[PDB]
């Protein structure tokens, strides 16, 4: 039997199978406690639990696709949707440090230590995987993954104990203490292997193709319009007909989508109580851009997220500025004009999406509370689904010697750490590209850069990512 | 070309610390046995006498 490190995407006219492999490292915990919290806010505080476990977060898109493979994805296909996912934990080498006392560290190898692996197929434990935090994976396959520690927030009971105003969320009857050691635990010793084998639900595709037409300009530019438009107001209408030059008063049969607090340049847009509780709903809905290119510069929005760096790394949503969205887009009403910045849902509407890019998420989670709309596509990129890919928790073990009969001899957790290899494969159901009788060469697919500093390549940790994000809508539909 | 890296086994950590050398130190010895066959032709004829 052959032991392999697998990596690489294989394309077809149908789905592409993209696998990657990293080296993980379950470090250590000198205390295997649970370590509740002590936040004690003073102005609704938080209340958590710090589990001694390690989950892994392969959420982003820049791990399954190389930049050459992402460029081959954009210039050849016109949709993408995942349908399968397997996570194999390869060769495990749990080892122990012997503390040379004069050298400090000497690492032998342990055959009796193990690595407790739990897969949460039943969704019993809280899901913290898809929120966009700075522990995902290395972008390049040569660096070592350090998987994050598992922790979660619960709901408790806010008290007010202190001197001035000190609040503290204590435990209530609704609060929960999920001990992960009440489960089934593939114990997974040295050399052991384990798999997950998830299967994605039917999700709508992401349509990696722009438009060569405005949605409000879909008419014959000649010929006028069969209908009329008012001239006088005040009870005596006196409607007139239209010519072909009436472009700003052409009647549309479909409205644009909502623009709830789209502005340009804290908390952004925010719900909450009077002025100071005020939790943020930062990257808007998915129907809104937060960065595009107007006639002179880049407009950058209040509701933007930076994706790195600062100056920021924002995706250029040029396909939302086209179809009647954008940042400083007011709506006007002739009520006895009222400039409004919020646009409502407007029963017949189309708002296409905020575009996915090379570094976006893949799923988040739709929360278990009911009556969702629309929630098929989450913000921060990705899909977002009921029953997401389950979390793979990885503790090592507390091997706890020696004793000597009465004594607390030694360290009693001796010291152990585990290295390994995680090979994650995911298949994406690709759709065929939309037809164009176009005759023009379509624009080329290359990541954006400015001058001299090229995109993904080593320079004199070396490897540098571009200033703008590499979006995915660069071929035209033609609507 | 037959490329041969070893691996970057990268311990220990201790939970937060950058303990040790983190590439610990490793080296690999081995044996490469390379066989090659050469299609030989027969020697050209000479009625030479020398």
């Amino acid at each position: 039997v052959k032991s392999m490190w697998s990596e690489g995407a294989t394309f077809s006219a149908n789905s592409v199978t993209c696998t990657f492999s990293r080296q993980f490292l379950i470090p250590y915990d000198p205390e295997h406690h649970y370590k509740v919290f002590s936040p004690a806010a003073s102005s609704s505080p938080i209340m958590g639990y710090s589990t001694p476990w390690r989950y892994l977060d392969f959420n982003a898109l820049n791990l399954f696709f190389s930049p050459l493979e992402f460029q081959h994805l954009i210039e050849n296909y016109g949709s993408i949707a995942p349908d399968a996912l397997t996570v194999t934990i390869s060769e495990i080498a749990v080892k122990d440090v012997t503390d040379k006392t004069g050298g400090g560290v000497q690492v032998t190898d342990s055959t009796t230590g193990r690595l407790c692996m739990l897969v949460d197929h039943e969704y019993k434990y809280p899901y913290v995987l898809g929120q966009g935090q700075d522990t995902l994976a290395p972008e390049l396959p040569i660096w070592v993954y350090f998987p994050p520690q598992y922790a979660y927030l619960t709901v408790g009971d806010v008290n007010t104990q202190g001197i001035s105003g000190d609040s503290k969320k204590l435990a209530s009857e609704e609060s929960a203490f999920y001990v992960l050691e009440h489960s089934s635990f593939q114990l997974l010793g040295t050399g052991g292997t384990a798999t997950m084998s998830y299967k994605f639900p039917p999700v709508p595709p992401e349509n990696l193709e722009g438009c060569s037409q405005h949605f409000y300009e879909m008419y014959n530019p000649l010929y006028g319009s069969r209908l009329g438009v008012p001239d006088t107001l005040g009870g005596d209408p006196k409607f007139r007909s239209l010519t072909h030059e009436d472009h700003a008063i052409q009647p549309q049969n479909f409205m644009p989508g909502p623009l709830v607090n789209s502005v340009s340049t804290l908390t952004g847009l925010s719900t909450g109580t009077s002025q100071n509780t005020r939790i943020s709903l930062r990257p808007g809905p998915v129907s809104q851009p937060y960065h595009h290119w107007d006639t002179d510069k880049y407009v950058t929005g209040i509701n933007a997220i930076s994706h790195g760096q600062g100056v920021g790394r924002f995706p250029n949503e040029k396909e939302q500025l086209k179809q009647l969205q954008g940042l400083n887009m007011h709506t006007y009403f002739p009520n006895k004009y009222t400039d409004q910045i919020e646009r409502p849902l407007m029963v017949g509407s189309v708002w296409n999406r905020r575009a996915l890019h090379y570094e976006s998420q893949l799923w988040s989670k739709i929360p278990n509370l009911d009556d969702s709309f629309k929630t098929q596509f989450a913000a921060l990129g990705g899909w977002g689904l009921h029953q997401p890919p389950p979390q793979i928790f990885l503790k090592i073990l507390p091997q706890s010697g020696p004793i000597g009969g009465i004594k607390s001899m030694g360290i009693t957790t001796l010291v152990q750490y585990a290295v390994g290899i995680m090979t994650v494969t995911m298949t994406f159901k690709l759709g065929p590209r939309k037809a164009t009788g176009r005759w023009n060469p379509q624009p080329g697919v290359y990541p954006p850069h400015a001058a001299g500093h090229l995109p993904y390549v080593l320079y004199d940790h070396g490897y540098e990512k571009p200033e703008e994000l590499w979006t995915a809508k660069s071929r035209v539909h033609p609507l | 070309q037959i490329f041969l890296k070893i691996l970057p086994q990268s311990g220990p950590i201790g939970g937060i610390k950058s303990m040790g050398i983190t590439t610990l130190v490793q080296y690999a010895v081995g044996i490469m046995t390379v066989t090659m066959t050469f299609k030989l032709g027969p020697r050209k004829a000479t009625g030479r006498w020398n």
Partner: antibody
Amino acid sequence: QVQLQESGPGLVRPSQTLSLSCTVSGASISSGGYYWSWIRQHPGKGLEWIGHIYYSGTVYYNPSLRSRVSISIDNQLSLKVASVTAADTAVYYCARVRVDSVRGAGDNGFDPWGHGTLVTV
Amino acid sequence: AAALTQPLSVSVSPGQTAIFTCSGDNLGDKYVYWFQQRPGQSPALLIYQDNKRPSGIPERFSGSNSGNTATLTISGTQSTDEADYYCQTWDSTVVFGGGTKL
């Protein structure tokens, strides 16, 4: 450069609210991740830590001085230690720590300190 | 740990070293920070993360953290290092040490 200047009221013995303040110069305090500590030092003895506060209201306290002191932020970094029947006057420093990444162990230490005020009790 | 141990004072001459002890339970898997407090002045961050020094601190200060102790070694002590040195860790709140009076 970032400097921290204190404010001392003087001396009040018969159990009044000891109020302090620490205006930060060089950089604003609601500009990112930095704790803002209050640290004591008894003359002839080691340092003592009261508590630190983030700009979004969350404040950690010392478990020994928990029900006496109160840290607050109105771009002022106040401290309202009451019940001064125990005559602790020592010294009151301000200090800033960069907020760590993993929340487990402290990745940074108190690099910018204050000048220190001498309260008497 | 939650209670750092540190002796009272040390005695040194110019031309040698003075190594202090900051004892503590499981201090090897922790960060220890050293603070230089000259008399009449606020402390300054001397050695952070058990080995590193900032730009304002000269290159004669170095420390270590192994096992249940963390030392601070001064290489070539001058006539201006007579200052209280405190070790400080983070046992989930903050833990300050006693101080070796030099």
